[PDB]
Design a binder for this molecule. Structure first.
Ligand SMILES: CSC[C@H]1O[C@@H](n2ccc3c(N)ncnc32)[C@H](O)[C@@H]1O
Ligand SMILES: CSC[C@H]1O[C@@H](n2ccc3c(N)ncnc32)[C@H](O)[C@@H]1O
Lengths: 245, 246
């Protein structure tokens, strides 16, 4: 194949995006290419062989906080692909992890495949549609060379975990829990773009700390770990085609 | 505004909800991918007197072959429809759950007052309210007076069934109706500043018993005629009006 020339990072919270924006001295896009009047934020730059763009759903017009979850993440994935036609999408962010699955706080995981835990449609074949099992782009050399942990990602639009959520997450044998990944995959799949995930563990879903409190306390230190790893992924991707990883 | 409405987009999640209306207005499936090439999305186009009518459906899932229901495809088709087709107003029309205790009956077509989510639980300050996603449908008082549709709040989530956690939030948010797309369509309509309204036809009573096969089939023809007929009368009413008039 031809060498990868353009990467787009999809990142749900600006705080998680910014250390990576610094590292590569990307600059904030000023011309609203994805749509006038949208709250979306885009940073762009060029690094050795690669165009680097990073897109965030930005702050909610009315409530002023990051617009997390499946819908905005899906919209910015769609709009950034149509506008920039990248070779690869990278969905990078924080997540819950399971101790029992070997997750530890600060671990930055590669994702093998992804599902949803909150799309329950008890009609045959709609049930499978709602789970939405999709494989990440095969990156074995990146996996091997960066020495990343890998596991299944389970997505839903809640930060806590209901009984039914827990039932499906366990049944799907997920290691990791988030609010955007499976939706990013859905759009990447829809538009035929290779997708890879970097999910940095901020809290242990099966541990003894409350989720909300642990996620918030560990956000800054884990974001920094995420930046470190994203930086190495960008450097590894540079000059490769998709077969090389 | 006061400019007369020239263009209406219908966002309809399942093709079985869309095809009766499509046939009623003799809309044609477009040949030339107006929303982007190589996608499973379906666009039906026609004109009915003063009005351009677009009906858009997320279509068949490429892996499982069934209708691409739920908030993600709905949000994506709405976004792309707004950008490509530049409508004056969006109508999200389809079937839903209803609460008999909020006055819903099978076959009722509701005009929706406002929309929320029930499955975006984010229990941290100000993200919690964001997860609620409370938005108002476009004010249409004349259409309501004319058509005498029941009205109520719609609660959206990605599951057809109802967990106890869901029920709790649905009750807390005081919803009459339950679906899997509405609040996601509204979110996008709001982002792009397009008036949005909702026609929601009650197919099942979330707080009533299972119908027999006989009932379910007979109810279905009723729900189908009710949705189609109500959407027809809505198009006819909009024609010749500006947004201020409804
Ligand atoms: C403020 S909502 C939580 C944000 O961080 C991620 N996150 C990390 C913790 C975690 C968890 N335990 N469950 C679900 N999402 C989580 C989500 O994908 C979302 O962008
Ligand atoms: C095949 S999933 C059901 C579809 O019909 C709608 N619908 C029907 C009733 C119903 C319900 N009781 N709960 C949630 N969505 C429902 C949804 O918005 C979705 O497009």
């Amino acid at each position: 194949l031809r060498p990868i020339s353009s990467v787009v990072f999809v990142i749900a919270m600006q705080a998680e995006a910014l250390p990576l924006v610094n590292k590569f001295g990307l600059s904030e896009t000023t011309d609203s290419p994805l749509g006038k009047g949208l709250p979306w934020v885009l940073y762009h730059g060029v690094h050795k062989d690669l165009r680097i763009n990073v897109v965030c759903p930005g702050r909610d017009a009315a409530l002023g906080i990051d617009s997390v979850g499946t819908v905005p993440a899906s919209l910015i994935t769609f709009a950034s692909i149509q506008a920039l036609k990248p070779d690869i999408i990278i969905n990078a962010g924080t997540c819950g992890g399971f101790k029992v699955k070997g997750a530890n706080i600060g671990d930055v995981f590669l994702v093998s495949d992804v599902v949803f835990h909150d799309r329950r449609i008890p009609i045959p074949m709609f049930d499978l549609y709602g789970v939405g099992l999709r494989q990440a782009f095969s990156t074995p050399n990146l996996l091997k060379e960066l020495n990343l942990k890998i596991g299944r990602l389970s997505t839903g639009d809640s930060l806590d975990m209901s009984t039914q959520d827990e039932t499906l997450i366990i049944a799907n044998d997920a290691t990791l829990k988030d609010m955007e990944g499976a939706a990013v995959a859905y759009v990447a799949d829809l538009l035929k773009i290779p997708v890879v995930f970097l999910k940095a563990v901020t809290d242990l879903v099966d541990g003894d700390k409350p989720t909300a409190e642990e996620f918030l306390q560990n956000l800054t230190v884990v974001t920094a770990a995420l930046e470190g790893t994203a930086t190495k992924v960008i450097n590894f991707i540079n000059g490769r085609n998709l077969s090389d990883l």
